[PDB]
Amino acid sequence: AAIVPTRELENVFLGRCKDYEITRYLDILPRVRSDCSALWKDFFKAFSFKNPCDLDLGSYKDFFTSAQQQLPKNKVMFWSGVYDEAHDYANTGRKYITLEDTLPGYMLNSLVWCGQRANPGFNEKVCPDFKTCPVQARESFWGMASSSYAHSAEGEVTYMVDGSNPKVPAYRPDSFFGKYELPNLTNKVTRVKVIVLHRLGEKIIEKCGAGSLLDLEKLVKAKHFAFDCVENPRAVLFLLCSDNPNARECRLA
Amino acid sequence: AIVPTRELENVFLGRCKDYEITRYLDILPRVRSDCSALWKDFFKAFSFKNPCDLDLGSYKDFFTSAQQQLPKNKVMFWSGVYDEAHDYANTGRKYITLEDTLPGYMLNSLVWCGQRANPGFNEKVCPDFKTCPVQARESFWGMASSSYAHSAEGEVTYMVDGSNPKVPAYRPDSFFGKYELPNLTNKVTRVKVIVLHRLGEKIIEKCGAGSLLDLEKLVKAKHFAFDCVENPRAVLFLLCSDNPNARECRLA
């Protein structure tokens, strides 16, 4: 019913922020104008002195306005259900960008924090489990993060999905992609390129042009973008094969 | 002459704090010293001295403060193959590299040097990696390698470039040759060499020949077991991911 928050949240935030500013993605993403301390103030204002369950999509809006970078054309990737594979393939910004390579994504990835009403306005020892909050509160931070990131995409965007999960459709309207990313693609986007990941040794569940992927195809087209879809394209298959080289799908000529 | 990192202390302390609270928590222990104490040891090694006035001892206190116990069988060394080895080690999930440990993570890619005048480090320019004598040029990374190799236990892995016509896969004067191999202790049981044959490039070096034979001789003389493989499938597949039309990557 509870989760342990990250210790020294301000120090971690500011330390990640300074590391990023001087050393990370230097030739891949631009620097943000606001200094780390200003970004901290915006971040801490969004959630402090508020019950976690009262947050909503607007809570972190000003922080994301300050933190948002212009993103390289054609390079933005979204992912659903395949965090490791999508990040491994995107290769720390070198092939695609993910939210986690952007400043706000990088500063807060993996961290846990919570406001409270009593002083000092946040809790550094215990946080309620967020499943108890309404969905707009639970999704307050990462939901706005995704919206702001998607809204900055231009050119082709790529969406990597799990095609091997019989319980979770490749495309779902209520996922972060469906709820915060796709609806925020602007007319600067030209094409949605879907990569369907079929895990090695698992029954194939979803296929391009069928089920939820056909629903997605229709929606992308109704939003006036080009669309393509590939299953385990060679480059991704080789990546899966590196972690399971003796899988039947990885046999050499 | 090369460009020093801006805000060196802010970056060191920011990476130090990030690492302390959030990085490698399930694979490497925390160190006892706080980030401000580690800064103090690091800074005193080079500060208020001419930028070449260093030797292997200069960062002794920093490295002893920063050294972590390392996961048995998980240590990797590398020469000439930065991206491939780091990609394969996969930020500590499969192997550890020096760059995943606290001191390697903090200083990786940074540039700094001392000067005599206040503030005791040069924020404008640092010497090219060739103007200082060898024991000074290798002072920080040499001792990082020494300390790291000395903490290795069980099987260790070494990835080398077998496709470089100018530079042997193994050299006694590389960091591995000079600082790592000689610091492997009796807790090490086996040196496992992985030879990278870059895709589409001529093979220069192979297991059981050339400098790999020299290495095998030395490893055995230390009573460690030895094996060597060229482009083992897991590594080949990683290479292929970035170049899937290469002839080495044709599938059944």
Ligand SMILES: NC(=O)c1ccc[n+]([C@@H]2O[C@H](COP(=O)(O)OP(=O)(O)OC[C@H]3O[C@@H](n4cnc5c(=O)[nH]c(N)nc54)[C@H](O)[C@@H]3O)[C@@H](O)[C@H]2O)c1
């Ligand atoms: N992260 C690092 O900067 C680093 C630097 C030096 C040494 N390591 C460690 O020694 C082993 C790799 O050095 P070594 O065996 O000499 O391999 P390389 O031949 O690839 O050289 C390693 C780094 O050394 C850099 N390099 C570049 N120029 C110089 C130089 O003039 N003098 C000098 N001593 N090193 C230089 C080069 O860009 C490489 O990134 C490895 O197992 C790590 O545990 C890591």
Ligand SMILES: Nc1nc2c(c(=O)[nH]1)N1CN2[C@@H]2O[C@H](COP(=O)(O)OP(=O)(O)OC[C@H]3O[C@@H]1[C@H](O)[C@@H]3O)[C@@H](O)[C@H]2O
């Ligand atoms: N804690 C984090 N959460 C999230 C990041 C993130 O970096 N960290 N997220 C999302 N997110 C939240 O974590 C899950 C993963 O859902 P999952 O079902 O795997 O995929 P979604 O489409 O819901 O979310 C992935 C989407 O938003 C970023 C990243 O840029 C991807 O393109 C999702 O349901 C949200 O509740």
